């Protein structure tokens, strides 16, 4: 299917546009486990 | 309290041997007689009051259990080499021998219990500090704990 | 009587205090084994 | 108050544990990287509700005490539930192009750095565990089953 010029750039815009919420959320999980992680090796560290 | 209670029998037995070496007249008490002829014998004879100022550290006499004592709470706190390697080891992860002044100054002047900038210093003037800045530990427990030493 | 309870518990708080030395070791120790383990795991997969 | 004697403890033990840069009050920025340790998701627009220092905030003057972090920790816990994992991989269902059930590593790692906030390689390289190898196309069931254990 042929189409004109960035049309379908547009709609990746849109379509992602309508992901970014949920990714958010999801971001601030894997952040929070990655920043749980740094701290749990920060502990054994400071004990050390 | 009773600090004599906390050791091992290895340690115990090594303390036990060279008091034996150091016991010549085996009266079982740290005397003028025996260390400062034995230490003339080993080296540069330095039977002057120096020698005397550190028999004094006993409570009058100096005997064998009280020299155990005097050692014990000396070594109070201490831990085994490979254990501080160990703990060493949990900031050098690449198990190099060779962390940076920087690091070891964050890990010690403001984080937990602070470290005095003498007690830094100090650990240049005596401690295995290295070019460009770098920290050699592996040689640093062999002489903290004198193992292998 | 009171002579006596105070000797025991003196004995008690440095029984204690061994304990508490004892914990502190073996967890440093529990430490190092699994700093070994990390160690000796990504030496096997970098090998692999 | 919803948290429990325990809980309140454990928050405090976590508030004097994860310090210091000197005193002993909490950092604004590390206020938040304190709730994330303990296990929350929230957005950093939760912290811009008490909107300490209007402008760039190195110097992290809106220190807390025990009695501050407290009820940011509350709002925080009382702010929204979390989804399952459908929710999550529906997600990965409209980026992939393949239609197979995974996902090309270089095309996601660079997605999930670009859309939303911003996050590092060193960040998100981390996250995953199926690391690309010889396949491109990374299942990422394991990179969801992983994290959301936290
Ligand atoms: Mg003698």
Redesign the interface.
Known sequence: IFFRTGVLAHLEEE??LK??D??????????????????AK??????? | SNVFAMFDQSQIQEFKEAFNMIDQNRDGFIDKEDLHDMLASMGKNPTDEYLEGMMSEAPGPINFTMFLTMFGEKLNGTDPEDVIRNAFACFDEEASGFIHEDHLRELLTTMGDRFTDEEVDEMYREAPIDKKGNFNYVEFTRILKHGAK | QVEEMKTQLEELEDELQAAEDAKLRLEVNMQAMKSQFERDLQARDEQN | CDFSEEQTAEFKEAFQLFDRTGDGKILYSQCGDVMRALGQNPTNAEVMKVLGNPKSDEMNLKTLNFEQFLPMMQTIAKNKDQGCFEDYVEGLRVFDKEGNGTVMGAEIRHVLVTLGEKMTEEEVEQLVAGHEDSNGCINYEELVRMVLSG
């Open positions: 379509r992602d992901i970014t949920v990714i958010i959320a999801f971001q601030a999980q894997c952040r929070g486990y990655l920043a749980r992680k740094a701290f920060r502990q054994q560290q400071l004990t050390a």
